[PDB]
Design a protein around this ligand. Sequence first.
Ligand code: HEM
Length: 152
Amino acid sequence: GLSDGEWQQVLNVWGKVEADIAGHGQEVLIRLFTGHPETLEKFDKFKHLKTEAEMKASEDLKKHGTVVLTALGGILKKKGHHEAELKPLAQSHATKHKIPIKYLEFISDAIIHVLHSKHPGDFGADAQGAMTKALELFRNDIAAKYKELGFQ
Ligand code: HEM
């Protein structure tokens, strides 16, 4: 549960992402894969990437970063009223991709890391608080659907 002022902060931060969605999406995924190499094994289309240079050179990885962040941005713009947008993603991630909730924690922290890396000094403590709360709400509503499905 976020206040109006917290949502305003989230959507202000998101404007930074929308100015370069592919560059942000690429870096989020590279941070996830290099920090947590087990996550790469869930992607049949990226498992061939052995080095970070190959990851950086991959145009399909940048494409997928755009898909991921476009979906997250659509959810965030709903300011918590995201049941219809979140349900299919929870279902596909539990039943088809088999993504444990832990990996959603990993990517949430990766988003925070990338925002500080690309905007040092321009991602303030209030903005980090609100973004963190928004990602926690997203993860928590997914977790509820995972529990319904019995997925661990
Ligand atoms: C911010 C969190 C995330 C968002 C918004 C997101 C969004 C999406 C979307 C929109 C798709 C395509 C449609 C679909 O299959 O439902 C996708 C595919 C996928 N997601 Fe996620 N995702 C997230 C996190 C993750 C994480 C943490 C992993 C794994 C570590 C992951 C693994 C996958 C895989 C394996 C695919 C299929 C890729 C394919 O082979 O082309 N997702 N995701």
